[PDB]
Amino acid sequence: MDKFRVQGPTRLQGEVTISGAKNAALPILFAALLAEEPVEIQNVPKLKDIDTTMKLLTQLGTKVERXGSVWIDASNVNNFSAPYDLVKTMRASIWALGPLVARFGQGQVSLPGGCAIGARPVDLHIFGLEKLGAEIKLEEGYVKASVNGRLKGAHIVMDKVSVGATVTIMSAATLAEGTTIIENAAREPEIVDTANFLVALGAKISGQGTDRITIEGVERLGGGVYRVLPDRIETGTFLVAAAISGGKIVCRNAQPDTLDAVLAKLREAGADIETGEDWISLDMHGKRPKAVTVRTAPHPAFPTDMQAQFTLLNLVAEGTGVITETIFENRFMHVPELIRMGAHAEIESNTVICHGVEKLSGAQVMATDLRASASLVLAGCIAEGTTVVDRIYHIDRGYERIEDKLRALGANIERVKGE
Ligand SMILES: O=c1ccn([C@@H]2O[C@H](COP(=O)(O)OP(=O)(O)OP(=O)(O)O)[C@@H](O)[C@H]2O)c(=O)[nH]1
């Protein structure tokens, strides 16, 4: 069972190259099923889910290869079903459904349970496709969608905002006949990215990033080259790594515009920040951070995916600061772990009251959440002595070799086993 052994304290400084966003890479990989011509997907990170998607794509009949890029050739997709064995560990699998039915007239995806108690709803995906003219076939454990010819543009009002469902509906609509309007569409940068990918292929889409996305069906999607946007959360994690260690860092391959709220928040903490078209710099000038007040909210507001990171920040900052989760509940499970590290905080309802401390103390810690997990490792970096973060597979799934990046930054870290 992989573990991170960290020896601190150590100042995190230097440069880091941001990886492509897993959350944009995925929906884009599935959208490539619509491409009649070969496509080159640049800036794709090396992660478990990517591997799973590649296998899935191959299983469908698409030619797939990779490195920094992922070359795809969906000119001849012969198989129309995503089997249980290939979708079993990946919810994103549902993304195969839309492209299949829209381009080929039929698609089937396997669902572990669906009907199983606690299974994750895909109703939005199913119903959205239905609105598009697809005939739906439902049986416990699977979903089938089909249509005689082209799908049909429809006016779809989403009662529940869904990143996943927005991708499915938007993707399929690019090939339907007529215009499709998605009300209450997810706003995420990852949605704008997927949309941009589609447009790069010849699709007609506007409103991406707003509450209303308008899609005009076209004949076909071609091929070409597309560069997946930078990982916004990863960038945030590195920025904080420097902000909590009195360090200075430059993030290469970044996209400043996807981090407005995070950047302003960092400035509030006293950080000296600079941005270019593809870069972001943070400088603490050897200074301890200032405590800040944070309210997580829907994009473009402060991202809930940055919470754990900012909590850490407050925990070693000068003064007291409160962090409030306005939408999601139970996002403080990791806090007790930090307190075991000498941190001072109180969890009250949907908030955590932070009381900054000088130095943290190494300890054996663990968190199931990738962000919280990564915050633990960062804590290990600036804490006194040895810190051992257990079950880092969580981090491995969303971070492209964080160990190597941290090390280049001046971190004393090793990947170790201990069972
Ligand atoms: O078909 C769907 C899709 C999504 N949702 C619900 O919409 C919310 C936001 O939907 P998102 O699509 O933004 O979240 P997600 O994919 O990560 O959600 P899960 O993996 O946990 O399903 C989530 O809480 C989800 O349960 C549905 O009820 N039905």
Side-chain angles (χ1 to χ4, degrees), residues 32-188:
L33 289 166
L34 305 155
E36 298 180 349
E37 312 163 8
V39 296
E40 185 197 335
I41 314 297
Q42 321 178 305
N43 202 36
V44 183
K46 303 174 186 300
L47 316 163
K48 173 182 175 188
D49 298 327
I50 305 297
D51 293 342
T52 304
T53 301
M54 295 181 295
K55 295 184 177 61
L56 197 179
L57 304 176
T58 300
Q59 172 74 224
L60 300 171
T62 79
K63 293 171 177 291
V64 193
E65 79 180 4
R66 77 153 311 159
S69 308
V70 168
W71 293 264
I72 294 179
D73 186 324
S75 60
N76 314 88
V77 172
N78 163 284
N79 196 22
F80 318 110
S81 94
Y84 167 100
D85 186 82
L86 302 177
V87 312
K88 59 175 191 184
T89 76
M90 183 187 84
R91 176 181 178 60
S93 295
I94 189 72
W95 293 323
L97 187 71
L100 299 175
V101 55
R103 177 186 177 193
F104 311 93
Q106 71 168 283
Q108 179 182 319
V109 176
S110 167
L111 312 172
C115 309
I117 295 181
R120 293 298 77 186
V122 77
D123 64 302
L124 299 169
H125 303 255
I126 289 173
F127 304 131
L129 301 173
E130 173 192 32
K131 295 292 260 74
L132 301 171
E135 299 188 304
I136 304 303
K137 192 157 89 77
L138 304 173
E139 275 190 309
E140 173 167 38
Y142 85 76
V143 61
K144 176 182 177 175
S146 59
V147 62
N148 184 26
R150 282 179 195 260
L151 290 168
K152 256 60 170 290
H155 189 106
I156 305 168
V157 178
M158 303 190 282
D159 286 355
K160 184 174 193 179
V161 179
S162 161
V163 168
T166 292
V167 165
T168 282
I169 291 171
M170 176 186 57
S171 297
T174 65
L175 301 177
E177 316 182 319
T179 303
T180 280
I181 291 175
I182 307 177
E183 300 202 70
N184 305 304
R187 309 181 56 189
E188 286 74 0

